[PDB]
Amino acid sequence: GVHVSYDNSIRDADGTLVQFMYGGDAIDITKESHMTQFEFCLDNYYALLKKYNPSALIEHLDVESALKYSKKTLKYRKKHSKEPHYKQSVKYDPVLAKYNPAKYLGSVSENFQDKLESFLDKNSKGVNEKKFRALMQLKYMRSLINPGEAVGIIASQSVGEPSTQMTLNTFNVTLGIPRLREIVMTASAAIKTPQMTLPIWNDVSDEQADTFCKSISKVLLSEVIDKVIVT
Amino acid sequence: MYKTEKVDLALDPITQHFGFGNDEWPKEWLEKLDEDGLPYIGTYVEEGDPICAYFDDTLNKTKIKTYHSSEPAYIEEVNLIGDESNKFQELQTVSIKYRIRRTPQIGDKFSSRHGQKGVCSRKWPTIDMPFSETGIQPDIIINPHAFPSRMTIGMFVESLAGKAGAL
Amino acid sequence: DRLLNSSDYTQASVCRECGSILTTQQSVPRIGSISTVCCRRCSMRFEDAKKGEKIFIDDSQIWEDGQGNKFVGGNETTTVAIPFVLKYLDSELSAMGIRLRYNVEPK
Amino acid sequence: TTCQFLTKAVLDNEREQLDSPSARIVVGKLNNVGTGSFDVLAKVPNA
Amino acid sequence: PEDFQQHEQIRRKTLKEKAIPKDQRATTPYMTKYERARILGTRALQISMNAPVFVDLEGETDPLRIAMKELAEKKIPLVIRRYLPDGSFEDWSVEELIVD
Amino acid sequence: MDISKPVGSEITSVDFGILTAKEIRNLSAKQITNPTVLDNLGHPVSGGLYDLALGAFLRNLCSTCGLDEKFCPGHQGHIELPVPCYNPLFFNQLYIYLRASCLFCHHFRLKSVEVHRYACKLRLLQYGLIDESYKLDEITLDISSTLLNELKSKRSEYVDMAIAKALSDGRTTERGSFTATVNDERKKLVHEFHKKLLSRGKCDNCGMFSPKFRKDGFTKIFETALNEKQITNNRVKGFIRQDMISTYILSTEVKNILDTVFRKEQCVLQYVFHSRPNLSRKLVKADSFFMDVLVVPPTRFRLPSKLGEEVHENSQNQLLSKVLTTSLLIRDLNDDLSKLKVSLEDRRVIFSRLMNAFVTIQNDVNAFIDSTKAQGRTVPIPGVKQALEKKEGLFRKHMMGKRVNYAARSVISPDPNIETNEIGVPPVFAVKLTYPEPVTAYNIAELRQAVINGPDKWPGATQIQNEDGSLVSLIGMSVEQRKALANQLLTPSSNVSTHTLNKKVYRHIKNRDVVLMNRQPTLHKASMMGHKVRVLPNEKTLRLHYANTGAYNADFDGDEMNMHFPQNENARAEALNLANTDSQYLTPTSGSPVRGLIQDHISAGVWLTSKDSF
Amino acid sequence: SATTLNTPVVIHATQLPQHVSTDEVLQFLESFIDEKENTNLSSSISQLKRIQRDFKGLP
Amino acid sequence: NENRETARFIKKHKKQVTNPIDEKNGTSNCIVRVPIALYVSLAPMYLENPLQGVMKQHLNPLVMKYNNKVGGVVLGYEGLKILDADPLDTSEKLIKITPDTPFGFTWCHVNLYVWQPQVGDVLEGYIFIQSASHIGLLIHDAFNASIKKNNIPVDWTFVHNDVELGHWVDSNGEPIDGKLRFTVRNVHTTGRVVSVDGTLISYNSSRSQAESLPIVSNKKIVFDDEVSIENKESHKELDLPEVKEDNGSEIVYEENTSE
Ligand SMILES: [Mg+2]
């Protein structure tokens, strides 16, 4: 039942909301390929500009609302770059949260925005850096997942079909289909190999960390005994 | 391909009898079966054709056992067996052998003695087939892209050995 | 096309008043009259229909079955396209004493 | 557990809104996904 | 007669309540892959039932290729009723929707 | 499916409920009383499972609708059970309500204020208001009746206000809001309610103890006798009654206990049994858990299975005949009971005869519904529950999945001369697979030829459908009749009732058609694509291009593929624009290509595009 | 005979039937017969002409 | 609750508007105007002219035929109006098309003029034919009416003509005039053409429970003539098997022995 609604959100068969936006950016995977291939798109500017015909769209969309907002979010993002995620500003939320991607040119994912701006800075090259930005903004607009798309079936098929390739055994932790079954199929509270990844500081040395490993590792009486003599 | 069928009349008093009943006789059955009700050895049969004929007194009608298979056949052998009796002898059991001719069809598998099996993709004409300097066109064509994955070098040495031994 | 149209697509009669495919039946008409789809559940036995002043049945409301029994009402029947397994399922559920009510639009 | 879920449905006096792909297939209704996510209406000129 | 007039009033009131006016509509100006598929299929179906065609079918025998030609010249007289998860809808004509 | 046959009515929703005995008796076509199915000579016996009132059977016309075996839809009948029986599916529930109720005041042993608290919470949950159901627990003032009745009043006041407030806004409709989280909160409460109901030993309303009820695997209940501490408790609380004015228990006694309890506790059960508000205002009666009658499905769904010559008896008729034998026997036991009585005393025998009569019919009822609830017979016959869950189940084997018409299967063979979006169809399939093409002015020329060509010459036609709805097969006809019918295709309809319609030609699959190619297992939608039909002469296998090898995960090692031929333009458009091969260049798994040339073509390209190649 | 394209799905009286005078019936008949005359409908107009004829003259 | 459930059934068969006897004519006005709502199909051939569709398809086969819902004979329709599927100024409306077929379905408003004759209503008809057991009549020279022998007064006596057909004579002793006034006893819809069963003779007939006691003699005449008609009709188009005896003799069934 899970599909794309006409309000771009991922809704179940009964109308209950599952996601507010597909992957948080509403992009069709069968389109997200050359969307970061900026040099390719640049070498084929006029070819793609003729493809994504904007003359029959300029009257149906907004060209500034989202673009202005995108700068306001980029402003507050750069202000708290070194700051941690909990201390980050919550004044302005993403441009995709406030403007419909199919109606506002510029309501693009911050991931795409960062990647696109970084290309225009690191590459100074009759195409202007401003008219190229518009083409890529328009490419993202034309790469949106269509309302009605059964993203539910597609997701389970995208997890199922390649999980056939991992039917072979190990060459400690649970892998392949048994591990996938522990998650998706049984949602086990009693995992076969429960683990914890502890990030060690820089001020703690390789010897100190190994001593710490010994300090937490379970020690049995058997492990310290060499011989037992019963007379 | 040879296929054998056992036409037994058992399902103690004898009711079904091999042959044809008097007064009742449906049109053109004599084309496949002989006076005895058994088929003429060599006759071509298709599904629906009568493979044998009998008469059962319980229904007082002349019935037939039909031949049914997608593949048509020819009668190779008809054997009448009247065993499991001391003095009261009468036939009830008959064994009929079918000869089904099988020419190589598109889909049939063929393989060298090196585990290189492949289905018949097409029966390529000799004029369209590549012709050797000697004037010979190959009987079988194996694709070179088969060998790099299978690593069946035994077939490669078999090729130059078979040629040397033929000459 | 696969799971309905070219499988078990059946245009079946349903009563809008009680929402069922199994109570509907073709009425048995007289020499000149035409047969009409009627619901056995919603129709009342003619004799049982008893009576401000006296009321009279408009004739078009009285239908007869093969047994010769007269009925009053149960004429609010229509046609819906459904899979035949549904009819077999509803039948099986009915044996268990479970009733399926199909809400059919327009009403 | 078809009969078990059916029992729970009857006891709830539940109304199957026929909005899930499965339910739609059961009653022969067009699936609400893709081409079934909208309706097609014809524009007619006469009043 | 009295109970039906109320039922009709409720039916038409609920319809109007769900209809999103032409100005307030906020879905994609682009015709979805699914919309195009159904429009071409439904119009082809109409063409096969001797429906008045608004294009010159120069030797065309396939109703779908006729429905495709009618789409190219935006002569398909159909409307898409885009439903939202609450039951409300946006009526979009085939003419106004952008086709790739 | 016919486009010439549109449907104006549609099923919008399905409502689950229980059939009442009164309801079944009225709709029934005939009362089934006879365990025999056939009279002598071979005619169905009157009052038996094969009665003609249940539909047309044995080349006889139906005695209800009058139609023959083809057009008769079949009619439901009924078996009158001489004593009520527990419905197997709802036994566990009626058991819960039997153990939860007081046998004296005939209320649930849980305190009325606590019961009302659940009824309030469950009423607020009929509408989508969970927050309000929890806020009800905050409403708080061995406790006097004048005080507790004020608590019930204040709680009912909040419930009526919270519903009306939310009803004023778009928070909930008159039909009530229902979500999965709402359903989760309902399921939690209905569970907690039954848990609190079963926990109480001594009745909180009237302090008298009730005798505990025990159960076995089969539908049968027993009453365990009270202990001396509880018996003396009944005595001391016996005077307050006056001022106001293990042993097997029969089905009638249980029904009579639940009858009063379901009347006295109607307010809570109204919301316990209704997911959304009860707009129908129907009473929640105990007789829904009991079966006073059995519906007899139409003869149509109980036909005897024919395998070659042998005609085998239907397993449902066998189970139904068993219910009929027991019913006649109890009718005699009750008739002998009616005769005599002055002489009694030893009434341990009359109850023993009754217990046997009740447990025997119950078993026969159980055996028919769910076999895994019936006594072992020296593999048993499957019940209706078993019929819906035979293997994968009726829903999985015949609803979610189905065997289809206009489809073919064949071994795939490679072909680089056909388009990457095409399929090589053998002429064998092309002469059998037909499309219902409606005849018009623009295609009269194309279809006239197909009609002349007939069903064995491609591109031909196997059949022609007239506007009256009738079919004319072209199979047996010679070139002369076919030529005559072709000159009658575009003739105007004389009948005004079909002037809207035009003739159809069931034409052979042409080179412009869409087909659904399928290679099992269909692990991803790319393994089921739309291909353009290309009829290749002198072929016995499905020809497929090498670019399709990846998506189908099909190797030409003797693999088989399914070809589906959709029969309408909407299904055509879908197979040509959505599920078509070209629109499946990139897989949605990683957005990477699954289409390309595989072996000779790659080796050819390295040589052709080499500098040395002139 | 009795199909979705022949007969309607449902018919409902939107209001109670309001009685019409002899002159209103005759005014309607004249209006309807003139509009329809302007295939099996012809036999119904033939019968309708008889009613109109009876509401003002003699057969 | 005992009478509450039965109360819904009475209102279902309750005569909405009764036909009143006016202008000292003695006859009851049965022609009535009723505005209705239809749900009709629209053929794709009528997609450019939808009003002509609804008319030629569903409204034209409706006229001069009895419609069960309006409770009378549709004499015609006036003011057809298609209800737009889109709630909104223009003549261009839209109709919802079935997902499966190219046909659309729409709600329509049209006023129907129907001939609604209930029982007890006094009507006039021109005598068409007059047999020994019935009198044929024509209401407005278009609607069929019949008065059975039992529904004719006892004082009346029929006289059969020998020359060539018969004629009925009234109580006074003179033949009956071209036009005849009668009361509606019953209305038969189910058949091909609408037929009105009429009465020429008309609660407090009880003489110490005498009304409850039926006169078998009179009750027989109305039942025997009814059965005789039903049985003679059932014998029409009755195929019986040809029986040949074990001698080669065909058993011929003929009540009359001689020619
Ligand atoms: Mg391989």
Ligand SMILES: [Zn+2]
């Ligand atoms: Zn009904």
Ligand SMILES: [Zn+2]
């Ligand atoms: Zn029947």
Ligand SMILES: [Zn+2]
């Ligand atoms: Zn108590």
